Amino acid sequence: VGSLNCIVAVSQNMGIGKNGDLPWPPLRNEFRYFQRMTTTSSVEGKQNLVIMGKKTWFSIPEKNRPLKGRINLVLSRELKEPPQGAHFLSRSLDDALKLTEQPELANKVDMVWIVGGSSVYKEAMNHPGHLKLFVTRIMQDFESDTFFPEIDLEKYKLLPEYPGVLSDVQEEKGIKYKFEVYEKND
Numbered sequence: 001v002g003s004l005n006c007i008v009a010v011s012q013n014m015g016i017g018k019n020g021d022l023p024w025p026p027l028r029n030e031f032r033y034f035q036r037m038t039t040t041s042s043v044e045g046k047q048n049l050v051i052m053g054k055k056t057w058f059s060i061p062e063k064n065r066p067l068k069g070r071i072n073l074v075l076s077r078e079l080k081e082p083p084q085g086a087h088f089l090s091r092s093l094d095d096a097l098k099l100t101e102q103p104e105l106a107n108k109v110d111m112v113w114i115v116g117g118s119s120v121y122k123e124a125m126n127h128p129g130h131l132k133l134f135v136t137r138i139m140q141d142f143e144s145d146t147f148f149p150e151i152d153l154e155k156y157k158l159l160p161e162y163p164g165v166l167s168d169v170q171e172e173k174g175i176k177y178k179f180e181v182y183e184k185n186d
């Protein structure tokens with residue numbers, strides 16, 4: 001199994017969601033970037049596996065779920081089976097990562113992409129190991145009710161550029177944003 005990554009888009013006041021939607025109006029190319037980064041796998045005959053909390057899973061429009069071309073795994077302690085359209089269910093992040101080592105998935109999974117919510121990000125970010133964060137900075141404040149956890153820059157290094165990621169300022173619907181990639185290894 002390849003690398004472990006989180007991917008998020010975040011406003012200046014650290015918001016990632018409001019009432020199970022994004023805080024900002026749809027940014028079509030930002031979403032295109034999210035799709036491209038999570039779907040693209042180097043390794044022939046494998047797919048990447050996206051892990052998300054139950055609320056994130058239900059925040060994706062039914063038309064778009066499961067996220068096509070990736071293996072979709074939902075985290076939940078309440079659910080007893082994967083939701084309709086999902087592939088896998090686990091009771092914790094650690095369980096999910098362990099599953100990835102089982103026979104069912106060991107040779108199927110390339111990169112693992114955590115896509116929220118707020119508590120799945122936090123546990124990933126604070127667990128020892130090699131982890132990258134792909135962070136889109138939406139450069140304006142937006143009213144939010146969910147937030148991205150604190151990035152500890154003592155351990156997460158912002159990379160000066162990364163292949164496949166644009167380095168300059170993007171703008172859609174009058175909202176400026178930029179892409180960043182952070183890396184820790186501890």
Ligand SMILES: NC(=O)C1=CN([C@@H]2O[C@H](COP(=O)(O)OP(=O)(O)OC[C@H]3O[C@@H](n4cnc5c(N)ncnc54)[C@H](OP(=O)(O)O)[C@@H]3O)[C@@H](O)[C@H]2O)C=CC1
Pocket residue numbers: 007008009010016017018019020021022052053054055056057059075076077078079090091092093115116117118119120123146
């Ligand atoms: N813009 C961005 O970058 C992104 C924003 N978002 C936003 O996130 C918002 C959702 O907020 P948030 O509270 O984070 O929702 P989450 O996606 O974190 O949902 C968490 C729920 O799923 C289950 N769960 C979560 N973590 C675990 C875990 N670690 N182990 C086992 N089960 C777990 C729990 O349900 P249970 O009670 O059944 O156990 C929990 O109530 C959405 O509205 C969406 O808009 C989401 C992704 C990206």
Ligand SMILES: CN(c1cc(F)c(F)c(F)c1)c1cnc2nc(N)nc(N)c2c1
Pocket residue numbers: 007008009020021022030031034056059060061114115116136
């Ligand atoms: C979870 N998700 C999402 C949430 C919604 F509410 C939607 F209506 C939607 F179409 C996608 C989403 C959207 N854009 C993202 N962009 C980046 N960079 N990273 C994510 N994890 C992400 C998630």
